[PDB]
Amino acid sequence: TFLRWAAEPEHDHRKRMGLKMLLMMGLLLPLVYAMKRHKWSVLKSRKLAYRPPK
Amino acid sequence: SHTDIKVPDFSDYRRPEVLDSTKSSKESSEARKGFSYLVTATTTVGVAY
Amino acid sequence: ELVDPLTTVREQCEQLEKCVKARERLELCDERVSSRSQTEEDCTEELLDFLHARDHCVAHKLFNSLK
Amino acid sequence: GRQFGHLTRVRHVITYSLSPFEQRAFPHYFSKGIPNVLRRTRACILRVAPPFVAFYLVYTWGTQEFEKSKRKNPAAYENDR
Amino acid sequence: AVSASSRWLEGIRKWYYNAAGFNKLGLMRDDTIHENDDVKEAIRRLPENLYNDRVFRIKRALDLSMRQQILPKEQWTKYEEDKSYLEPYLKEVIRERKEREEWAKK
Amino acid sequence: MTNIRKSHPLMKIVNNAFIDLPAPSNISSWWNFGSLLGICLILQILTGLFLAMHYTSDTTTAFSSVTHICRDVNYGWIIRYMHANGASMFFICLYMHVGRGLYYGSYTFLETWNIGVILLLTVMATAFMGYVLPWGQMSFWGATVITNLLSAIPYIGTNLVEWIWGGFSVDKATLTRFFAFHFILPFIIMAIAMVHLLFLHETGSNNPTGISSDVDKIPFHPYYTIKDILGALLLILALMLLVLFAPDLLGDPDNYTPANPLNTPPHIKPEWYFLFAYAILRSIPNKLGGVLALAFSILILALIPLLHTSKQRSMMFRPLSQCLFWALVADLLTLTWIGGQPVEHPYITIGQLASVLYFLLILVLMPTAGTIENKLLKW
Amino acid sequence: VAPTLTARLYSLLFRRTSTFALTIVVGALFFERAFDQGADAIYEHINEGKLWKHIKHKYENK
Numbered sequence: 001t002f003l004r005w006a007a008e009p010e011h012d013h014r015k016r017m018g019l020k021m022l023l024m025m026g027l028l029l030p031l032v033y034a035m036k037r038h039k040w041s042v043l044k045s046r047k048l049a050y051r052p053p054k
Numbered sequence: 055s056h057t058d059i060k061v062p063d064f065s066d067y068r069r070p071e072v073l074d075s076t077k078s079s080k081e082s083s084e085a086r087k088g089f090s091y092l093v094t095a096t097t098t099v100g101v102a103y
Numbered sequence: 104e105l106v107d108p109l110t111t112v113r114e115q116c117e118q119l120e121k122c123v124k125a126r127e128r129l130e131l132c133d134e135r136v137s138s139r140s141q142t143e144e145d146c147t148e149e150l151l152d153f154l155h156a157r158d159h160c161v162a163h164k165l166f167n168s169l170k
Numbered sequence: 171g172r173q174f175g176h177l178t179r180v181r182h183v184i185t186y187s188l189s190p191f192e193q194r195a196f197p198h199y200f201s202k203g204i205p206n207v208l209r210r211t212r213a214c215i216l217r218v219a220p221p222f223v224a225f226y227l228v229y230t231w232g233t234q235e236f237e238k239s240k241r242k243n244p245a246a247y248e249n250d251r
Numbered sequence: 252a253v254s255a256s257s258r259w260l261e262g263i264r265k266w267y268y269n270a271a272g273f274n275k276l277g278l279m280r281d282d283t284i285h286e287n288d289d290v291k292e293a294i295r296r297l298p299e300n301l302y303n304d305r306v307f308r309i310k311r312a313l314d315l316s317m318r319q320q321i322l323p324k325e326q327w328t329k330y331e332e333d334k335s336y337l338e339p340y341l342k343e344v345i346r347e348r349k350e351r352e353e354w355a356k357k
Numbered sequence: 358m359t360n361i362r363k364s365h366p367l368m369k370i371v372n373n374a375f376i377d378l379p380a381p382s383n384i385s386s387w388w389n390f391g392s393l394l395g396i397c398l399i400l401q402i403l404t405g406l407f408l409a410m411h412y413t414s415d416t417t418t419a420f421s422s423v424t425h426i427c428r429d430v431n432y433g434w435i436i437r438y439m440h441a442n443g444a445s446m447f448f449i450c451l452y453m454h455v456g457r458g459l460y461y462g463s464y465t466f467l468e469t470w471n472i473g474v475i476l477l478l479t480v481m482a483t484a485f486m487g488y489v490l491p492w493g494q495m496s497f498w499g500a501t502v503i504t505n506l507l508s509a510i511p512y513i514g515t516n517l518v519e520w521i522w523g524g525f526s527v528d529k530a531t532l533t534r535f536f537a538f539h540f541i542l543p544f545i546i547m548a549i550a551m552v553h554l555l556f557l558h559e560t561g562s563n564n565p566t567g568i569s570s571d572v573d574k575i576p577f578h579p580y581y582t583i584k585d586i587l588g589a590l591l592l593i594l595a596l597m598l599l600v601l602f603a604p605d606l607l608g609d610p611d612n613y614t615p616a617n618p619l620n621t622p623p624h625i626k627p628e629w630y631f632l633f634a635y636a637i638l639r640s641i642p643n644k645l646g647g648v649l650a651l652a653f654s655i656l657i658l659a660l661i662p663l664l665h666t667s668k669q670r671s672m673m674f675r676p677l678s679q680c681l682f683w684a685l686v687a688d689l690l691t692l693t694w695i696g697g698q699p700v701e702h703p704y705i706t707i708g709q710l711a712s713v714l715y716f717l718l719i720l721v722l723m724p725t726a727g728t729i730e731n732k733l734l735k736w
Numbered sequence: 737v738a739p740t741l742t743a744r745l746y747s748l749l750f751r752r753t754s755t756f757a758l759t760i761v762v763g764a765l766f767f768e769r770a771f772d773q774g775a776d777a778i779y780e781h782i783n784e785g786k787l788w789k790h791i792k793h794k795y796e797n798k
């Protein structure tokens with residue numbers, strides 16, 4: 001375990017960010033994923049009508 | 055002529071609160087909006103962190 | 104004394120089939136080697152294989168068994 | 171000129187759309203979309219996957235082909251002579 | 252040097268012509284052409300009735316791509332169905348530079 | 358444009374090259390990449406910069422400083438890996454940008470291509486020098502190799518070696534020369550970046566369908582901006598995910614070994630992304646042969662637009678060529694793993710196999726195919 | 737019938753731009769203070785006796 005620690009003293013500490021970012025991460029993406037669609041909601045809702053005077 | 059048009063129905067995409075046309079759109083409107091914005095505000099926050 | 108779990112766990116694994124199996128080949132090699140060791144012949148190749156699967160067994164065991 | 175003005179000439183198209191608040195961000199997202207997976211996932215998969223499979227064989231094929239070639243000297247010549 | 256095999260060829264056509272989505276997607280052979288500067292002059296000579304009906308499809312066409320929703324398979328375009336309407340007018344302009352170029356040689 | 362905050366400073370009139378840039382309707386995520394690319398470039402710029410502060414290139418000392426960097430410097434460790442761990446990601450961001458190119462064959466745009474060409478060629482060379490910086494053994498020999506590869510030019514080759522060297526060795530000049538270049542260089546790239554964009558705003562964007570979309574366009578500011586917002590951050594995740602949990606995964610280069618000029622490692626391969634190019638080097642027994650083989654090998658990209666023979670653009674309506682397209686894909690991906698291996702014969706032949714295979718795929722097959730489809734399709 | 741918080745809150749905050757932005761600026765403060773604290777255990781509750789926070793209790797204050 002000793003040298004495993006050696007090259008990376010921050011090892012123990014650095015993992016914190018891992019759990020930190022994850023729950024932080026699952027937040028925004030669906031949120032973003034919501035917003036995006038919210039805009040695209042209009043485009044994919046299109047209709048077209050060809051009613052030529054012809 | 056011009057007259058024959060009638061808007062097609064999208065309603066599947068809608069939510070039923072306004073699905074009644076004999077509702078004034080204004081009534082749900084009150085609560086209707088914020089939830090949309092609620093995400094807007096909400097989504098914004100964690101970013102600042 | 105303290106006897107270790109380490110070498111303790113060895114024998115239970117080397118008890119397993121392929122162990123003595125190749126371990127025989129070690130003999131089979133070395134047996135052929137024995138007089139013919141005059142020739143280049145050497146058994147290092149085989150013993151690797153023996154030890155190869157040997158400790159994979161030992162893997163699942165004694166680490167959990169140590170302190 | 172002004173990017174949109176002079177683009178092209180177009181005649182007698184009509185468009186229909188709603189406010190985004192009029193509708194939802196999940197109009198039967200699951201139900202409707204899940205089938206669509208196939209028609210696209212089947213569409214190209216005819217055209218694309220198989221070449222890789224050949225590769226994957228070669229991966230094991232040559233490795234195995236490699237492996238014997240060295241790994242065992244007492245193979246072609248056993249340690250007899 | 253093909254007669255019965257000629258008949259035997261068209262299947263792959265009809266097959267291959269069904270192997271490219273635009274037959275499912277409502278196009279023709281004409282409208283899928285790469286852009287040509289002659290096509291410009293070509294498109295010039297199209298009357299609207301022809302010109303316009305080309306147009307409305309594209310508008311309708313692209314839209315499905317965004318949603319990846321292919322037309323109901325019956326309404327798909329068919330192999331027997333074809334119109335070369337573009338090409339004949341295309342053909343003329345081609346010759347025109349040829350003649351010019353030909354003269355333009357010496 | 359009455360009282361529009363666009364024209365009030367003349368500057369923001371230029372800013373209307375974006376807001377009102379029209380845009381195509383149907384667009385794959387595969388068009389995020391162009392904008393996605395610049396993202397990495399920025400985020401990088403800061404990282405190596407603050408890293409540049411505590412680091413120093415001095416042939417004796419330099420590497421030592423690095424040790425100091427990830428350890429005693431405030432948050433020194435997160436930073437090193439960042440600048441690094443962006444790099445490969447950025448490259449995978451690269452090829453994709455290319456990737457979209459042929460699959461829709463948008464290279465119809467002519468000099469724009471050539472721009473996109475040169476733009477790349479510099480970039481790889483950049484980190485190449487960047488990779489020297491850590492001063493690892495693999496760096497050292499890897500550095501030592503390629504210049505020694507250069508010399509084979511029949512008459513003038515010699516000096517240019519020790520000219521770029523600045524001596525008979527790999528020593529200071531060789532290094533600290535580069536610490537300028539590996540640093541000074543990318544800016545000019547950024548300068549170049551905008552140019553590559555300009556031309557595109559001559560004609561406006563290309564589509565999936567090989568069909569001029571002019572009938573429908575979209576104001577850019579509301580929408581694709583959003584999809585960007587999504588598409589942008591997604592990168593960061595894996596980028597930030599790799600870096601912390603499994604930092605050295607792609608850190609496959611193992612040498613923090615202080616480079617021994619005498620000693621040689623058991624194995625030398627460049628880092629992951631070169632390797633296919635490097636692999637192709639091995640193929641030719643002629644050392645000169647491999648050179649005109651290796652360097653030219655990528656130059657083919659310049660030559661593609663010459664070979665477009667079809668009457669319709671986007672591949673997605675030509676099924677046959679599409680096979681070749683994929684057929685080529687693994688062929689690239691193939692050379693990797695062969696390159697990912699030493700110089701024993703079963704691989705050798707296999708490696709020797711795909712080489713000529715490679716060109717045939719692009720150079721002949723692709724142009725050959727479309728002709729018949731025209732005839733097949735009655736064109 | 738009374739307006740659900742949204743109808744209120746929208747009329748309260750999201751309508752007026754600042755007010756909308758205001759609580760947004762507010763929420764994060766307590767949040768991270770709550771957030772930083774609450775998450776650490778999840779890390780820590782898993783990581784037990786392997787760290788001097790737990791370990792050094794063996795020898796700390798002698």
Ligand code: HEM
Binds near residue numbers: 392393466474
């Ligand atoms: C880091 C390098 C690059 C950056 C920052 C960059 C930036 C961009 C951007 C922002 C776009 C517009 C969005 C898009 O079409 O992707 C674009 C398009 C393009 N770039 Fe670059 N690009 C880069 C590399 C290249 C390379 C290496 C090539 C060709 C070898 C290239 C050729 C093109 C082409 C052909 C397009 C238009 C593609 C299309 O119509 O879909 N670019 N690039």
Ligand code: HEM
Binds near residue numbers: 401402408
């Ligand atoms: C796409 C952008 C860049 C790439 C791909 C690149 C390439 C590299 C490479 C290959 C390394 C060494 C890899 C490693 O240390 O693990 C590196 C580290 C470094 N790069 Fe860059 N460079 C880029 C931009 C920059 C910038 C903008 C700077 C400075 C502002 C810079 C300066 C440095 C410095 C000072 C280091 C030392 C950190 C270290 O080597 O650990 N490079 N960069």
Ligand code: FES
């Ligand atoms: S150059 Fe040294 S072995 Fe090829």
